[PDB]
């Protein structure tokens, strides 16, 4: 019966001083190693740089912040069915899912180099066009039939 427990998160990168990009490195690394992911990610900050003149800090923050939920549909089952009760989702899991969704969407639209696509997805999440904002949208819009579930506890 696991209870509240801490997490190990690498401290912010000296060149940008953001802990969020560090969790991105934590969760993007191919073959489970940073010996190779960091080069291309710094390239991506560069690609963001000469494309649309977006400084990585503000564009990355405005991309990650707009994909973040506020509702925890806590599971409660009947052993033959299941339902969800809406509580407040934890803030640590808030930022965790935000960064995970940003990273996992960041690497798609298979094309000539991953630099162009990752900068493209950073820009898309920056401009609030539908590529990862849909996560935040659904986490509140599908909690409407589940909003009825907030009238009772089971």
């Amino acid at each position: 019966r696991k209870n509240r427990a801490p997490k190990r998160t690498v401290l912010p990168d000296p060149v940008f001083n953001n802990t969020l990009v560090t969790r991105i490195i934590n969760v993007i690394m191919e073959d489970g190693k940073k010996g190779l992911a960091q080069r291309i990610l710094y390239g991506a900050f560069d690609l963001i740089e000469q494309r649309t003149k977006e400084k990585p800090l503000t564009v990355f923050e405005r991309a990650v912040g707009n994909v973040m939920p506020r509702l925890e549909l806590r599971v409660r089952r009947i052993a033959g069915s299941n339902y969800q009760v809406p509580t407040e989702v934890p803030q640590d899991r808030k930022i965790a899912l935000a960064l995970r969704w940003i990273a996992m969407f960041a690497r798609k639209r298979h094309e000539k180099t991953m630099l162009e696509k990752i900068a493209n997805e950073i820009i898309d999440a920056s401009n609030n066009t539908g590529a990862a904002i849909k996560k935040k949208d659904d986490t509140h819009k599908m909690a409407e039939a589940n909003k009825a579930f907030a009238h009772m506890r089971w």
Binding site: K147, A148, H151, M152
Partner: protein, 114 residues
């Protein structure tokens, strides 16, 4: 137009049916779970009662209402959500009326639900 009327809500055990009526009990509007799209089984939920009550409160009030009676009948799981919605609707009420069946005895209900 009309300065006085009534709103009858009925929370039957698995349905929410409501009508806004004239002071002589002549309906000017009505709503039910099916009219909202809750036809079937989701009409027993408090959400259907709350949405029905909100809709009819708006229809009776924005029409030109000042003071209205609220006749609540039946018992379900959303008869309290209904009055909460009326309170949140913004319609003047002097007191909530109780029209629930309160007999000593009477007709015999259906067979034992097991």
């Amino acid at each position: 137009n009309v300065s006085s009327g009534i709103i009858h809500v009925s929370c039957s055990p698995n349905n929410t049916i409501v009508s806004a009526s004239d002071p002589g009990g002549n309906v000017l509007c009505w709503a039910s779970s099916g009219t909202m799209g809750f036809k079937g089984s989701r009409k027993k939920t408090p959400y259907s009662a709350g949405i029905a009550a909100d809709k009819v409160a708006k229809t009776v009030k924005e029409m030109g209402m000042a003071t209205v009676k609220l006749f609540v009948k039946g018992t379900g799981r959303g008869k309290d959500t209904a009055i909460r919605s009326f309170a949140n609707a913004g319609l003047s009420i002097t007191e909530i009326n109780e029209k629930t069946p309160i007999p000593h005895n009477g007709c015999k209900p259906p067979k034992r639900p097991r």
